[PDB]
Amino acid sequence: ERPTFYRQELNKTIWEVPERYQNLSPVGSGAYGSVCAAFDTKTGLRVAVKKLSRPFQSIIHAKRTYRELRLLKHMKHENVIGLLDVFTPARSLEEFNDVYLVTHLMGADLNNIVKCQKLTDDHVQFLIYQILRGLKYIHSADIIHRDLKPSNLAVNEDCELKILDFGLARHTDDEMTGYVATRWYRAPEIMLNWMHYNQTVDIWSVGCIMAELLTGRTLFPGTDHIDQLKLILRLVGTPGAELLKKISSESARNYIQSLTQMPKMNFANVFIGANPLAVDLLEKMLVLDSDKRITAAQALAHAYFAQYHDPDDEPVADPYDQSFESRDLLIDEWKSLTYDEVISFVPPPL
């Protein structure tokens, strides 16, 4: 039974939503993308409604739309954004072009918190703890996120954190899409081992995010790929002989060998006056060699989080099963698969 919809132009975009969702208001004046705060009169909840941007604009984006909806429907964890509702104004597959997702309103993202002049170390402890708690869960499902960054972490007024945006997430595999992550948070093996990174790229991003929380500044704000690589090497040091041999790009190896030799910095001399345990965790997160990087599960046991760590309150997931995602499909197949997932969504009990 299709609800009554109504239509409204919001910042040069036509939103069409069920009448239960009232007083749509773009968060931050529309600077955070296509997300509106609303009041759900059916539940009395304050919700955030995301209108997916151009979900079927290409084969790649259609695929990403399907993966994100499937993952969001599969996952159930306090530090991962959860679906209250999923809808489309379309009355049939034939006119299906728009997807809307609904969750609890959170009210800020980590970019706001980075600017907070009253941020304490305990706050950093609690925020990074929750990112890692969500990441332990995600990785245990054999999901890889691939786009962690401050704007993809929502924080509510109780400093409860949820990972947003699974648009680039997928089931992990030996070979995956090459150009992923946002540049300032992109792990170096994404550039050095084209299409053959693994879940530790997400730990790199968390390291970059923690550093930004501690200092108030982007850790590696590169303006291009060469710039980005050099900014990283200035901190973690240029690779030695045994590590070069794991770099699959001969052009990258050749370029790196042309640079001045750089040692690993003492992070205690970068993050001045930070908790020594925070510096220690950062040293274990921001390591060039992917195989020596700390895991999410290991990081939750780090002494930095002793106030919050509870090994029986850090659950793992049921592993995610990749239904139709292993082949190259046309947009119309991705649309039909996504339509079926919209029509079959069952809202959680209140």
Add this chain to the structure above:
Amino acid sequence: LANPFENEFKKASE
């Protein structure tokens, strides 16, 4: 799909 990183690396050396 093309690798944009190798392009920049080969140029930076050149």
